[PDB]
Design a binder for this molecule. Structure first.
Ligand SMILES: COc1ccccc1-c1nnc(N)o1
Ligand SMILES: [Cl-]
Length: 115
């Protein structure tokens, strides 16, 4: 069902290396709905190429636009399994400290802060 489950470690590594070659300015991001999640919809895809200069605050705005949320629906984003310490950090910096061993940056969203 989940991305890590659908693709072998070897396959995720090779795909990160292709994005390096073909989209060298992009951060490879996996974005997944919390398996408990009731309110928010699922995204139309799993794998996102994010411009390495956007900060986490702008990535939250991007995802909320992709879900076509309205102003008072709540949205919480975990990165590498934990809360974001700050939304002002550029994604190139967040990537270097929170990337997985396969080379993707893993995110999960929910309407509850209690995931
Ligand atoms: C640490 O990365 C590698 C290690 C061994 C062989 C290839 C790579 C690689 N990285 N990006 C591409 N396109 O290939
Ligand atoms: Cl690029």
């Amino acid at each position: 069902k989940t991305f890590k489950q659908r693709r072998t470690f070897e396959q995720r590594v090779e795909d990160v290396r292709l994005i390096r070659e073909q989209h060298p300015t992009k951060i490879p991001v996996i974005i997944e709905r919390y398996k408990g999640e009731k309110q928010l919809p699922v995204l139309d895809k799993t794998k996102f190429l994010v411009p390495d200069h956007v900060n986490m605050s702008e990535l939250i705005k991007i995802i909320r636009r992709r879900l076509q949320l309205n102003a008072n629906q709540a949205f919480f984003l975990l990165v590498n399994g934990h809360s974001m310490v700050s939304v002002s950090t550029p994604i190139s910096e967040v990537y270097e400290s929170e990337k997985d061993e396969d080379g993707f940056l893993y995110m999960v969203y929910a309407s509850q802060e209690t995931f």
